Structure formats: C-alpha cells, structure tokens
C-alpha cells in the first residue's frame, strides 16, 4: 500500500498561568506512535505504540531534543502572531502545525506537508510543489514574504524528501505487522421502526482499518445525500474504526434502498439491501 | 523522525 507520516503540534497560551502548553503527537496512517506533553513530569518524547519501543536510546534522546526545540520555537511563534494581529496579551490563543510526508508501494516520496493554523483557521501552508507558500490573510503574507527571502521552502523540502521518508520507511519496516495491514469493515443493516409507517435503516461498518471509508445510501440507484444521517468515523479504542449511515424510509419501500461501502480493504465495494 | 529546524512566523 501507499503510506503517510503526520506530526501534529498544538501550542495554547494561558496568560497569568505561565508559559504556553505544548502537545505533540505522531502518526503513521491512523496509528499513533509518539507524543510529547510539556505539562508531563517526564519532559520526554514517549512511545504510544508497543512497536516503536524497539528504537535504540539515540532515537529517544534525539526525538526528545527536537520536539523540545519545536516547543520553544512555537512559544515564540504565539508572540509573533500576537504582534501581527495586534491582539492583547490577556487572551489564550492556539497555534497548530502539521508536517510529514507520503510514500507509495515502492517506498518513493509522493507528497510533503508543512502547514500552520492560528486560532483554528489556516495561517500558512507549503504548496504541493514544495517551492512556495499559500498565505491565508494579511498577517500570513508577512511570514510568506519573510520565508521566501530566507529560502525556508527549499530547506524544509530537504527534510521532507530526506529525514521524513527515511523515518516513515523505518517505521513501516519495524511496525510492519501493525502498519502494513487492512482490516476490512464488517457490515450489517438494522431496521428501526419510528412510527407504524416509518423506519430508520442503519448501515454499519465495524472493526476497519485504516479510517478512510465511504458509506452511501441509494434509492433505485440514485444517491440519497440529502436525507441520509452519517456519524463521524470513530475509534473503537483497539486500533480499528466504526461508522454508520441511516435513512428514514417509508414502511414498504425498504427494498428500493441500498447502502454502498467503499474501503481500501475490500476487493470491490459492497451493496447491502434490507433482506434479513 | 522530527525536524531539526522549525521556522519563525
């Protein structure tokens, strides 16, 4: 399969409660493997996957150092942001970053990422060409102008094409039996009378990995986008995902309706009809 | 493998 590594960091200021809280997490696909919490006693990059525990001591000493350096830079970034937006230093503000890389089956670089959000909205992102920046407002295009002068893109591009794919390829080879798997969704429908003349038909997908999945209702093979309820895909807590989709249906019309399930772990998409 | 040099905004 094709694979991704994502590093996510959140800095939240809290004036008159000391220095910004910083929390960072790392994923390969939908599997978390590390975390750092600047309020924890450890002050370390901690394993959050049994399989990463195999990395040698250099790995943990170095990863701790880098994320701590990040914590310090994103602290200063909260302040720079405060200046750009002309905002008081009484308010709590949130700075969010995501970087990482994708590889294909062969292990070859596919795509890099490097993006920030201030107070919950896009601030700046590296474009998919890796040579320039999308600035989202007047404040971000100060950063964009500064980063184009400093050549941050071709430097971060060197990390995304290098250390980032190397990391990913090593996690894929050391976490093999966890990460190079698909669990296909286990699918069933439930009929739920609402009135003597109505029912909710609920389409279930359980125990699937990875998280990405499409659940669709049709009626005579027309999509029911408008009248379908659909829950966010949710974690089971055991490294699998759950989802459902529901349509309210006239009593008697049940067999006009089909549920379509697409997922990377299915040979061909599933069609389900209220048969049982 | 984390970055070794985060940029300033």
């Amino acid at each position: 399969g094709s694979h991704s590594m994502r590093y996510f960091s959140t800095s939240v200021s809290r004036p008159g409660r000391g220095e910004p809280r910083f929390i960072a997490v790392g994923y390969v696909d939908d599997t978390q493997f590390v975390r750092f919490d600047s309020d924890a006693a450890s002050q370390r990059m901690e394993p959050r996957a049994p399989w990463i525990e195999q990395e040698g001591p250099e790995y943990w000493d170095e990863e701790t150092g880098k994320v701590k350096a990040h914590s310090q830079t994103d602290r200063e970034n909260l302040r720079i942001a405060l200046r750009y937006y002309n905002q008081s230093e009484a308010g709590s503000h949130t700075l969010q970053m995501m970087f990482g890389c994708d590889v294909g089956s062969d292990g070859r670089f596919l795509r890099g990422y490097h993006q920030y959000a201030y107070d919950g909205k896009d601030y700046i992102a590296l474009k998919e060409d890796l040579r320039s920046w999308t600035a989202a407002d007047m404040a971000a295009q100060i950063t964009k102008r500064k980063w184009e002068a400093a050549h941050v893109a071709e430097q971060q591009r060197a990390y995304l094409e290098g250390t980032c794919v190397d990391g990913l390829r090593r996690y894929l080879e050391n976490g093999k039996e966890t990460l190079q798997r698909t669990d296909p969704p286990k699918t069933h429908m439930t009929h739920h009378p609402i009135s003597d003349h109505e029912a909710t038909l609920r389409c279930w997908a359980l125990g699937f990995y990875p998280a990405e999945i499409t659940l669709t209702w049709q009626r005579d093979g027309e999509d029911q986008t408008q009248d379908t309820e659909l829950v966010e895909t949710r974690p089971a807590g055991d490294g699998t995902f759950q989802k459902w989709a529901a349509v309210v249906v006239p009593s008697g019309e049940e067999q006009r309706y089909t549920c379509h399930v697409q997922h990377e772990g299915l040979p061909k998409p599933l069609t389900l009809r209220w048969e049982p | 493998l984390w970055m070794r040099l985060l940029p300033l905004l």
């Epitope: 150092g65 400093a150 941050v152 060197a158 990390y159 250390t163 | 070794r4 300033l8």
Partner: T-cell receptor, first 111, second 111 residues
C-alpha cells in the same frame, strides 16, 4: 547590508571586565556567538531566538554572560578576563538557516 | 560523537582544479556550508548545498554531496592567485542551526 560589531579590536588588562556589541542584519530573529582562534574553525558560544537565550555551550565559564535585551543588538560580557580569553569573537544572524557573520571583535588580554 | 574533518593545507598551480574535501557528522543535516576567510577577519558565506541535491554549480565553484557517506567537496574550476584563503565546511548541529566548523583548509595558489 551585513552584521556589525563594536569594537573591531579590544585590548583590556588581565582580570578586568570587557563588553562587545553585535548588531545583526535588520529583523534577523536568530543570533549566534562563536569564538575563533588563529588556525581553527569557529566554536559555538550561544544562541538567541529573539530575546530568548535557547542554547549555550559548556565552553562558557560563569564569567561569560550574553544578553539580547530587546531581541535586537546582543552584548557579550567577560568578567575577570584571562590570557586564554584572547580570540576573535564572531557574531552571525539568520532569518532561518543562512548564517551571515560580522567582522568579529579581536580581543587581546595582556598582563 | 565526531568532528567535521577537513585537511589543514592544499597547494594548487594557478589554472589547475582545486578540490577541497570534507566529512560531516550527521546524515540528517539538510544543508552544508562553505565559508572563506582572507587575511584579516570576515567569514564570507561562499556557497551552500541542501541534502536533497547531488551537485550545485556557481560560476568557477562546484559543490558535490554524498549524503549516505557524508562527503562534501568544493571544486574550483580555474584557480587564480586571488582564490588563496582558508575554506571552512560548516554543518548545522542539533536543533537550532548553530554551525560546527571544520578546522579550515588553507588554499595556496602557486604562480
């Protein structure tokens, strides 16, 4: 255009205090102090990210004391100067990763 | 771990190729620097390469990089007497971009 340092040359008496200024390129957030001896590559002394002094070498005795009070110009202080403190004191600034160096401060401590 | 290793001296004939060689410490370093110093002070940033490039050329200068073996080399096309100086290869160390330097290759150009 480049980084600026004052003075270009200092000669103090041994056991006296001395102070150099560094003025980085306008709006450069990152400031590095290095030490160079004739015949050698420069050696890291300290790192400022605006105001914050984020990383300092164990080549600094307690006597060595750098400030960047306003995230602007930096000062380095040596208390009770010794013969062994004779060197070029280099300042460099970058926006990210490209470090630009000053003309240094050549220090000589004589008895 | 280790240091940045380069030769202290290299002699060339005016008009011959100069190759200056360097081994650096950490394969993850995203950029590598060549600095040059002439009589007096003044570390001049001469050229740089990112770790995702095999090669970079800039007039009479050429930089070749081997990331796996951590070999960096400055090649000078048409060495003039004016090219006589000390060349340092410099690598970012740790999680700022503080530089560690080679000991410097003094370049002597014979008429």
């Amino acid at each position: 255009t480049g980084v600026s340092q004052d003075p270009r040359h200092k000669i103090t008496k041994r056991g006296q205090n001395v102070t150099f200024r560094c003025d980085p390129i306008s709006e450069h957030n990152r400031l590095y102090w290095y030490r160079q001896t004739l015949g050698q590559g420069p050696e890291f002394l300290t790192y400022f990210q605006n105001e914050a002094q984020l990383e300092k070498s164990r080549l600094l005795s307690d006597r060595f004391s750098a400030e960047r009070p306003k995230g602007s110009f930096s000062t380095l202080e040596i208390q009770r100067t010794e013969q062994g403190d004779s060197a070029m004191y280099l300042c460099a600034s970058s926006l990210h990763h490209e470090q630009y160096f000053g003309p240094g401060t050549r220090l000589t401590v004589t008895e | 771990g280790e240091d940045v290793e380069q030769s202290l001296f290299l002699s060339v004939r005016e008009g011959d190729s100069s190759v200056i060689n360097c081994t650096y410490t950490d394969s993850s370093s995203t950029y590598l620097y060549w600095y040059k110093q002439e009589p007096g002070a003044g570390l001049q940033l001469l050229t740089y390469i990112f770790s995702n490039m095999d090669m970079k050329q800039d007039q009479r200068l050429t930089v070749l990089l081997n990331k796996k073996d951590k070999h960096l080399s400055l090649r000078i096309a048409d060495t003039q007497t004016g090219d006589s100086a000390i060349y340092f290869c410099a690598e970012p160390s740790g999680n700022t971009g503080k530089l560690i330097f080679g000991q410097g290759t003094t370049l002597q150009v014979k008429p």
